[PDB]
Symmetry: D3
Subunit: 308 residues, 6 copies
């Protein structure tokens, strides 16, 4: 009575999750008008079932969001017992504050939309701001890629016992210090004032830029330069979410990175073809395990410092 | 104290609306990000104001809806006194029932998202189904194109006194019989076998006016037009309040026998009008301005129907 | 842990449903003041149980509605696990639109009342307008009498392969075309302009007026005349909901119908005594099966083209 | 800008109310269907108005409640600025607790239906229990008949300075002691063994005034009156704010020793008053008009208590 | 999958409940700032579990309330299947009406706070006003101490067949008459006009003042005098809730009571040390049994006239 | 038409606020019961008024929150037109995320209780995290102490042009870099190994200004100050918008090398100021009065940031 569904034809990640759970993705008939008006038809009964919808990695965020919302609605009015939105990369999460302007808090709006659509539960990975859990009243499991980042570092960087973890901005301080303390190394921090300022020791050390997401990568590319200018031996970038829109791929190919590491919360395959610097940590097993635990009523906190 | 904002690039309707009310459109900064992630910013204080946001007409329905939702929200958390969504063409309106499938009622979803975004009021034109009004708990004013369509038929088709109004599908009956009764003329109805088309009612040697609420690819109204010709209509017109016109529509129209195709201003046609001469638009901005003004003043909106 | 309750002493239908499920109706103590103020007492524990309340066929709609609402409330605050209102004939369903006047949408109001009373689920039959499902946020199963109408037609009208399905109004087009296409015959349609207009072929064919409901029957009685005037051989009327208030019985006895067929969503027994033209399709088995499926988490979509 | 509508045929209270405020009752079309299915239509625009709907007094409680609910809803979706239900006698008010049964809290249900119908405000008189106010999240103004009942006792019973106020049941204690304290007189209390009636307090050679919030069949206040006679009261009165008076009430009253039976205008008595001379009504329309007017103006309503 | 938690270090009652259910109290890490800002950490998974939080008897009502609310929240966003607040003594219950002033209905506010905090169910004992059940939409089980009061009376007062049950105020009439009728004896009633008035027969009888709560006890102490003045042989006071704040203990020690009987809905141990007149009925078994029944979906109405 | 009430004994802020607006604080009866059970009563009609309730500053956070909640509720059921909570220092603001624990998001709980109590609007100062604004669905105006802190630094520290702003923790980065950028000076950052403190950035032979949003026991800013001395800062200041100052704070401050400790009026300091001379308060009442006045008038509040 567990049933996993996928957003659009970007099955990829959702298929991996389903394989790991010993399941097939449920049937969904998607008819799509040219104005992008999305039609959905759940091709099997979800009556009384524990349902999980994994949002697409299609790219177009608003299409993906509506598809998700529509699919949640269809399952709720078809008497699903529970509907969980598995959203590896939370959309509009950078729009989580007003920030001295007459701005929407779009991430709160997205949380409200998910709630009124009928979501009972959220499974996500590395919310841009932890506080976003509080934008909901339903429970949220905010999974961490940290355990998998720590393990990647230990296994792929020989100098890890002597590296420096660098935040590309002031916001990311906590995230880097927590990784630096766990590994028992230093941290450093960059701040854009168009000028960057680095505080902290990177001289003669491997520098690992750690962030929750990279988009156009103008920031990490510029931070990489600064770090080499400050005497870092080489520079790595580890992001959980690899958006990589616009010139990001061109930016990374021209950059002085030794590697750019991301998870597959966003589909990376086509980006990789055109970019040899990209390596992907598979997090499908962390997503599958959180679903399995959710379903069984078993501890998921164990997924916060364990790689299943 | 009243403020009008527009959604996205399609500032035509909203400009027309703002003119009739003697206003300028509110300032709104709209920066478009990575993967179409919508950014909006209200470039002026709306604190204590009666706000009207007029939908975009730029095709991409999900982008338009999100922008509208984000705008509504932005005005609300910035202490707008009231927020009305002006949605001439209601998105997802066809998806208004399960229809014997495990389908979403997407129009109810949209109603819910609009309400939770903070909309206090809706103004729209010819809801695909009247019952959609009941999808909200806030007031909806569902304006009619009917008066202006009636007006146009009388002022443009010489033989209108012995014309027949034809619904393209069976689910279009109520709309066409209401028009047919107003003009005191005939009505007829087409049905696709669920395949061949079936026509019920008299069209022989009279003008056939195809009336429908919206036409997308125009596949149905095009095939409908053929049948009306096969059944010996003099000439066939096409009246649609919402003229979406996607995919093959442009050419499909021209290649069909249509004397004319008539639509409203609810969606922009300027782009389609040059590549298709037989299209004509009824401007509905006066109707929308009047509804906003009357909504703001608390005067009757009902006489506009 | 399934428990079925009945509205008032109009047990009839609710008793048939209970028999088909192998159950007794649960005890309810109803004390009723003269101003019709309804008192209810649930005479057994519903704590943790899956509860279904079948609304009465008493006649007085507002009494019945309040009784239903009160009973839903009592079961919810007594810790029922789930409360489903089984409402064979949805009240105020004709009040589903504003229709160019300053009217209530009373069917939306009834849906809100059912929701705030604590209904988790609705089971109903042939909503006057499908869109009424959208008046709720809880799931609605809108059961169709169509399968049972098709089977009645095939078994009782020898000429069914050559009949015409007629809508008594413009609103009913879809409903008749769907039946006409399934049976592979014609459809026709009447429109009241005080004048009726018939479009479609009924000459020398059996005409079957099909509608979701009949009240005072002035419409079907007048449509029957029109059809005979247009050369129909005989006229039948098939309604799912037989209200039959006011002069309906006198109207039907004087009418040129060969038969008036209705379901027992409304109690028909006393109406039949005074009206030999009435035949009743028993739909208690469709109601019982939807309850059973709901309870078990089994497909109910099968009830949409199958007669259990 | 203020508008008063009445529910159903009992337009007496509402007429009195509209007069005191210098208004005419709003136009409302009320077509009554098949099985008592209620149809209401607002015959005028209420857009941007402060609306007051005064309950019906036509017996059938479920019909009255539905009509009121439908009216409230109709005004809300037609963009009324505010909707107040004026419910002099709150329906289902006795059903306000489970009371050691698997019973509904029907008064909370009613509170919820009123709120979801769109009521912004309630005005009522002598809630059976004060706590009912807490069944809402919207403001309730719970007016008191007490001042006018006190007034009547002093102006109508000669021996009032040595009278005793008697509660018909034990759950009526707080009401009677509050009256007894205002007049500086005695109080007493009747209890039915849960059978024989038990009386606690002094009534010998004094006037006994039975006070209760509502009397339906009058079975209890009639048996109460006998006991008060048995215990040697001079003469016994009956004061009820809500005089429902169903079933055997009419005659039961006359056949009982009651000097007089006093009720308010909250329910119509004109029909009962002719067949029962000993009934007298305190008109409470001034109190309800004053509460509406003060509610609309935002002036004190609290001094009316 | 039942899990019982306690408010603060006032485990006492919550420990007794847990013992009776064969359970240990779940781990809770409570860190408390000096401004009394309460921090909580649920020290074990509640994912998918039936959770019961027993509110502390600490004394400071607002601290206790917030602790309860915070704990309910933590369990809900940690995916508890159900959260029940077991609140033996409902806080702010005397603030249940406006009472001719511009007052809050604070008990309604407390019910709203409990609801938005995420409480699915309430278990309580002898609400000051039954109507408080209607301040919620979630179900409330309002347990009665009456069965245990009746049994205490029958076992400890030899003259019980000839006693009088007295309400200390006008509000308590119903409560005393119900006890007087069950025991088949008289009732009497006191009313404060600063003057008390007694109606009813207490001459040469044992008088038992029965109330739902005693605070500073100025009322029961004064009622005791009045009763002796009216010829009662001796006076008892039975309260379900023994607040006993301010001079209550000094008031009771100076009073002409034969005994003051209360339940342990409030911790009584330290009050007893300084007051030999106090006897405590243990109601932990009634609380444990309601939890057990709730959990199992079994009748709790049986707890309304049975001492488990 | 506007009314200001204060919560509990700490009537200083609220008095200052009421003065700037030319008002007297509303009458409120506050009787304190048995076990701290809070009683509040509004001593005047607030019907149809724009109500502002200013939080208490009397330490006990749970008592203050309940009183505020009860006050909000009391004004709402007494038909206040609008209720704004003025909460200079937002309670439970640190508890704004789970933070890798099975912890409550207590600030979301508080947001929810405030909303269900009936608050239409919040006015507060320097939310611990901006995202807290998103915990509500009602408008929040989150005022900034930054302008006045900048002002104070320039007008009080002679060497400010070559100073460095130091965050006591790593989670304080964004706050200090924003200040450092405004003054065009350096920033630095302290981190406790999770043990020894680590400092990143230049402080040698310059004035170190410790900036944080709130300081409770001052354990962190005290140890931070030592490190800044160890790393050769000229002298170290401490700027906190919310100066809670509990437990060892008073003496801990004096025993530390702090040139001065600067806080705002958001919490009362008068009691702490006498036993600690190095404390100085920026009065923020003008800012709060201006926000109320502008909120009531519907004028810009955004320029106050």
């Amino acid at each position: 009575n567990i049933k996993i569904f996928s957003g659009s034809s970007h099955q990829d990640l959702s298929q991996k999750i389903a394989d790991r759970l010993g399941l097939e993705l449920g049937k969904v008939v998607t008819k799509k008008f040219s104005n992008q008006e999305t039609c959905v038809e759940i091709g099997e009964s979800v009556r009384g079932e524990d349902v999980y919808i994994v949002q697409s990695g299609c790219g177009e965020i608003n299409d993906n969001l509506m598809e998700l919302l529509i699919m949640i609605n269809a399952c709720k009015i078809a008497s699903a017992s529970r509907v969980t939105a598995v959203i590896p990369c939370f959309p509009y999460a950078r729009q989580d504050k007003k920030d001295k302007s007459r701005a929407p808090i779009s991430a709160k709006l997205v949380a409200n939309m998910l709630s009124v659509a009928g979501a009972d539960h959220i499974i996500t990975m590395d919310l841009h701001a932890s506080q976003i859990q509080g934008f909901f009243d339903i429970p949220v499991d905010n999974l961490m890629a940290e355990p998998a980042v720590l393990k990647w570092i230990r296994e792929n960087i020989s100098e890890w016992r002597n590296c420096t973890i660098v935040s590309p901005d002031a916001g990311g301080a906590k995230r880097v210090t927590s990784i630096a303390d766990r590994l028992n190394v230093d941290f450093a921090l960059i701040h854009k004032e168009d000028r960057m300022v680095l505080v902290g020791d990177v001289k003669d050390r491997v520098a690992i830029l750690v962030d929750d997401m990279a988009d156009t990568c103008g920031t990490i590319c510029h931070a990489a330069d600064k770090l080499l200018s400050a005497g870092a031996t080489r520079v790595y970038a580890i992001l959980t979410h690899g958006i990589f829109s616009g010139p990001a791929i061109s930016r990374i190919n021209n950059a002085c990175f030794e590697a750019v590491v991301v998870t597959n919360t966003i589909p990376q395959e086509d980006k990789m073809k055109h970019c040899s610097k990209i390596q992907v940590i598979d997090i499908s097993m962390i997503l599958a395990e959180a679903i399995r635990r959710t379903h069984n009523g078993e501890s998921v906190s164990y997924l916060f410092s364990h790689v299943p």
